[PDB]
Each structure stands twice: as C-alpha cells, then as structure tokens.
Amino acid sequence: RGSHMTLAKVFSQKLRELGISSIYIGHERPSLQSLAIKMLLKNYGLVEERREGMLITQDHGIKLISGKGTETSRYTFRKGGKKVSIHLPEYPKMVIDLGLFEFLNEEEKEKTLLQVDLCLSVIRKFLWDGNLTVVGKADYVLGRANIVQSLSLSDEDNPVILDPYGDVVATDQILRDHNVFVIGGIVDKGRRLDRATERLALSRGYSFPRVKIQLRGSIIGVPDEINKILEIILRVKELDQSLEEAIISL
C-alpha cells in the first residue's frame, strides 16, 4: 500500500470526523482502501465494541489492529456492521474507449471483453468501480463502473491518451500530473484507437496528448493488455511506484 491512497484519504477523513483512531480489522487486508471496498460493495461496516489487538499498520493516522496485543479499538470492522458515508473521489478517471469495438476482428473483440472485465478487478485493488468508465456501448454492464455511449468531459478533466504510437513518452510526472486516462483498443499491428474520444475531440476542436509507455527507451517489454496498462497507471499514481517498477511488476 501507498501512504496516501486516494480512497484511504477520504475514508480516514470521515473516521477522524467521528473521533475514530483505531479499528479492529480481523482477517481483512490492512489497508483503509481494502476496508472501504468491502464497506462499499460487500455489506461490511463498523461495530462498536472494545477489543485489544496488535498494531498491524497505521494508515492516514488510523491504527488497524488485529489478533492480540497492547492496543485497544472501540470499533470493529466486519460483516453486517454499519456503513459510514465517505466522499467518493472523482479523480482519477480511467476510461476504456470501446468506440472502435465493431471494427475489431473476433479474436480482438474477445480479448478486449476479457481485458475489460479484468479492469474491474484492477480498479477495485486501487480505487473503486466509480473511477472506471467504459465508453462506446451503452448496453454493457460491469459492476458499478460508469457505462456511457459517448464521452462526457468536464471543465476539470485533464486527459491523456495511452497510445503505443503516441509522440510523448510517459514519465512518472506526466502521469501524476494528469487526472483522466484514456485507453482504447488495438486496431491492427498496434495502434490503439480511442474512437469515441476522437469523435469528441474533432467535434469541439480539442487535442489531447498521446503518451507511449516505454521500458528502457523501448516500447518492448511493456504489456499491451488494457487491464495491465491500467494497473501500471494506478501503481504509479496511488502506490507512488516508479513507472519502471510498475512496468516490471506486471
């Protein structure tokens, strides 16, 4: 876990408001982001009760404890507990652009749908469903991700397009400095067409930067799976991982 995960931050803010400094987490993963996910999706919450345990981790100043030891909590995280409201983060936004879907051959379509589904598991590792948007087909359904036919673009979105054949090379800071990431499909020998976003751009005269991810100066060792690209971006932004190490780990 990173020290400053977006979802951990908003959860901890709420817990602090409530004067909660410790939580008995049991068998859960020792990360406020992991707890948030279970609270948002799986019917977990807090139960008021006195426990002791050992300090496992301290995340945004909230002690997460488990087992036995010298620490105390007054709230235990578990199934059927009460939820607390948190301000779910708008950013960052991960956008899968499936405008091109009907131009893909059958192998490409099949890979793509599998990769998209895998993205739901990835997003849940770092953020939550609501930070994932699939665009290009209004019918599909993928957990609680945002599903739209066309791209809706706010004043504050600062998008970059992930493109093996882009002219900008991705750096750590390019990624941290942007808040919306567009990944389209591979259309024959590599280029990644983001069609529904191209449509928006042409229609309003915008131009978004096109960013190629390289390892050691080459687009060689780099995954081209949408779900793997997504995880790289999120390693860097939410875990404060090096781009180099993020790529390695995948």
CA distance 108 to 224: 12
User: In this structure, what token pair is assigned to residue 140?
Assistant: 């599909």
Q: In which residue are the tokens 């990360």 written?
A: 31
Q: What is the DSSP string of 15-69?
A: HHHTT--EEE-TTS-S-HHHHHHHHHHSSEEEEEEEEEEEEEEEETTEEEEEEEE
Experimental method: X-ray
Q: Please state the domain extents for the chain.
A: 1-88, 89-250
Sequence-ordered strand ranges (E) for 60-179: 62-79, 93-97, 132-135, 146-148, 159-162, 168-169
User: For residue 174, what are its two tokens?
Assistant: 């390019």
Phi-psi map region of 216: left, alpha, beta (phi>0 left; psi -120 to 50 alpha):
left
* Contact between 51 and 70 (Cβ < 8 Å): no
Residues 6+ apart with CB under 8 A from 109: 101
Pairing label, strands 185-186, 192-193: antiparallel
Residue 62, Cβ neighbours under 10 Å: how many?
A: 21
For 23, half-sphere exposure in the C-beta direction (CA atoms, 13 angstrom radius) is: 30
Resolution limit in angstroms?
2.1
